[PDB]
């Protein structure tokens, strides 16, 4: 079965690391950090890796139950939450994943909404379950962020209206802050089992293997609850590529797929890139920053090549 | 090119009418309402209809700029989701992604200013009443309300991220099959994806049902779509020629190898089954639809 990519312009793609549309293609050759994100990870022959799952609604989402209000050494009202798999089944921490699928894969204060729908009805309140939802923040760098152990904590501005023992959903919306004390670093992984334990079962780090190349990212800008900043989240492949690769499960015929970014109106190649077997792009480029390309462009698979293929410069 | 559906269990599907996972398959034959949703509409040969667009992030989303203060109420111009100005003369009911039902939609309004060289930001919980006379997305303007009383900026890029419903009490006018008046009291809805219904006795519509969060109050509200967003995306990609009236599909259990039931997938992009009761389809979590063959509308479905 021949390898293919979907035919989707940048304006028809979404980020695989946060529920955002893709805004621009982006490079940063001077990056000192190891790139090892865990969402948006899929081999070209359709093996999901890391914490990657298929639902756009599952990216940086949690499902579980609040156990009780707790204390912590920062401002706010704090809650402990057991987490399940996103499909509702109990999370088995001994499974060979870094954390429940969908767990955030970066350091930061993730801002969103916690909502609950009660399991029970209370006598005198009627025959329909009660509900509540409130804004919340999850600090993925906190020693209390332990999703691989099956529980996390979140903080609310709301001081009382969160119920213990009731089904709870976290819908991600953006970041709370990117100030100094908020530790936003998109390439720093959480310690999924907390500070005392090594991460396990990680998708591997990615890097170009041919000199002069750099990683090419699909970049989205992420909302902020407040403060100053223009934070972005870079993914290796958009979520639609993860979904397509999973469906097709086409055998990879070499280590590297030559792909061309094409303008369908002219049929002409704008630039070429290497799509590596593990699921990431490299280009030959001598500028950093967003990529200037027409809005109707998309990647087309050309042929399988080897690691020594020399890309034309962008 | 042979017609196909993706191989995805319910736990791998998302709603095309609100950003939610699919929870269950569902029927309700005694529905008195006209079913004419505008999101999640795609023909089998890949033509999007209504307000349907491809992004899961675009469903019930808005992008635009706040004009002024008008709970506390704010007027917002809306653009296309790609940021380009919406042209009301375009042959669509409203900007693609616009909500397609009556209710108080709850979510977060966020802003990032245009002007250490870093812009200011703010975000607040917000509600959009799609039944309001001020809900006029086809005219390029809507209103939203906040609990927040002051910190919403005029003339700055503004995003609405949907989360659920504010309420489903009497005064909240939730009806998933009542369309908004996209141009308000001033003109009737136009260019709509058509209504859907079984045409032959003994059949009813089959829905992909999601339960939608509530900000407060009592209820277990649901949103039913005709096809999940992944099917819309798949059909759009494939654009396989439709060879007859109906794609016959079978819901199969891959573990036992058995067909559980069959359905008609109509060219306009909706399912019917031979059923005359309301409620869930009780099915194993590993089940999924498989395309069998093209048939015409006179094909008689086996009762499910």
């Amino acid at each position, epitope marked *: 079965k021949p390898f293919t990519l979907p035919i989707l312009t940048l304006g028809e793609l979404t980020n695989s690391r946060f529920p955002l549309p893709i805004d621009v293609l982006y490079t940063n050759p001077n990056e000192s950090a190891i790139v090892q994100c865990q969402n948006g990870r899929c081999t070209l022959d359709g093996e999901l890796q890391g914490t990657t799952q298929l639902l756009p609604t599952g990216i940086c989402a949690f499902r579980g139950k609040v156990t009780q209000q707790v204390q912590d050494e*920062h*401002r*706010g*009202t704090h809650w402990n939450m057991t987490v399940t798999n996103l499909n509702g089944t109990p999370f088995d921490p001994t499974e060979d994943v870094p954390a429940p699928l969908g767990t955030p894969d970066f350091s930061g*204060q993730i*801002y969103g909404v916690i909502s609950q729908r009660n399991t029970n009805t209370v006598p005198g309140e009627g025959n329909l379950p009660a509900n509540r939802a*409130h*804004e919340a*923040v999850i*600090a993925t760098y906190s020693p209390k962020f332990t999703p691989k152990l099956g529980n996390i904590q979140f*903080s*609310t*501005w*709301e*001081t009382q*209206d969160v119920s213990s023992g009731q089904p709870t959903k976290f819908t991600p919306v953006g970041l*709370a*802050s990117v*100030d100094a*004390n*908020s530790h936003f670093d998109q390439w720093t992984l959480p310690s999924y089992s907390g500070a005392l334990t090594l991460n396990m079962n990680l998708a591997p780090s990615v890097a170009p293997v041919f000199p002069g190349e750099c990683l090419l990212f699909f970049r989205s800008f992420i909302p902020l*609850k*407040g*403060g100053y900043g223009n934070p972005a989240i870079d993914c290796l492949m958009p979520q639609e590529w993860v979904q397509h690769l999973y469906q097709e499960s086409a055998p990879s015929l070499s280590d590297v797929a030559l792909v061309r970014y094409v303008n369908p109106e002219t049929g002409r190649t704008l630039f070429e890139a290497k799509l590596h077997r593990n699921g990431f792009l490299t280009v030959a480029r001598n500028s950093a920053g967003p990529v200037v390309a027409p809005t109707n462009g998309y990647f087309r698979f050309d042929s399988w090549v080897n690691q020594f293929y020399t890309l034309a410069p962008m | 090119k042979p017609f196909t559906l993706p191989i995805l269990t319910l736990g791998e599907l998302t709603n095309s009418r609100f950003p939610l996972p699919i929870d269950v398959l569902y029927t309700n034959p005694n529905e008195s309402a006209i079913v004419q949703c505008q999101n999640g509409r795609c023909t089998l040969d890949g033509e999007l209809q209504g307000t349907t667009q491809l992004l899961p992030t675009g469903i019930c989303a808005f992008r635009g700029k706040v004009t002024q203060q008008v709970g506390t109420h704010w007027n917002m111009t809306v653009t296309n989701l790609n940021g380009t100005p919406f042209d009301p003369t375009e042959d669509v009911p409203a900007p693609l992604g616009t909500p397609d039902f009556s209710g108080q939609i709850y979510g977060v309004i966020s802003q990032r200013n245009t002007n250490g060289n870093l812009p200011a930001n703010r975000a607040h919980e917000a509600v959009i009443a799609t039944y309001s006379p001020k809900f006029t997305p086809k005219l390029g303007n809507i209103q939203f309300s906040t*609990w*927040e*009383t*002051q*910190d919403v900026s005029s003339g700055q890029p503004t995003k609405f991220t949907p989360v659920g419903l504010a309420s489903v009490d009497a005064n909240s006018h939730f009806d998933q099959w009542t369309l908004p008046s996209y141009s308000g009291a001033l003109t009737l809805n136009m260019n709509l994806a058509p209504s859907v219904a079984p045409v032959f006795p003994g059949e009813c519509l089959l829905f992909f049902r999601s339960f939608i969060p509530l900000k407060g109050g009592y209820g277990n509200p649901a949103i039913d779509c005709l096809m999940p967003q992944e099917w819309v995306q798949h059909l759009y990609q494939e654009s396989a020629p439709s060879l007859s009236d109906v794609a016959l599909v079978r819901y199969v259990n891959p573990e036992t190898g058995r067909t559980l039931f069959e359905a008609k997938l109509h060219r306009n992009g909706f399912l019917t089954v031979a059923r005359n009761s309301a409620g869930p389809v009780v099915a194993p979590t590993n089940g999924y639809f498989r395309f069998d063959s093209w048939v015409n509308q006179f094909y008689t479905l086996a009762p499910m």
Partner: nanobody
Amino acid sequence: QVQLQESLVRLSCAASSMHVVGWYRQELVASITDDGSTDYVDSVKGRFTISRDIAENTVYLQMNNPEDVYYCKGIVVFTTPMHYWGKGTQVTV
């Protein structure tokens, strides 16, 4: 989510424990934090006095000129504030 309530020549604020409570006018007038720290706009300095009272569950603004509606505003999570506003009271001299 909380409900603040205020009060033409003692204004009380009441809710449904906050980190800052401040009085505004239409610009900031006077604020008090849960450290007990206060601050005043330069035009109000010396004449105005903000004061917190835990025992009586409110925050008063004692004002000691014609250039003088006034509002109560109240929570931080990590380092991110959310503000809650009352509906106000007119002031005219």
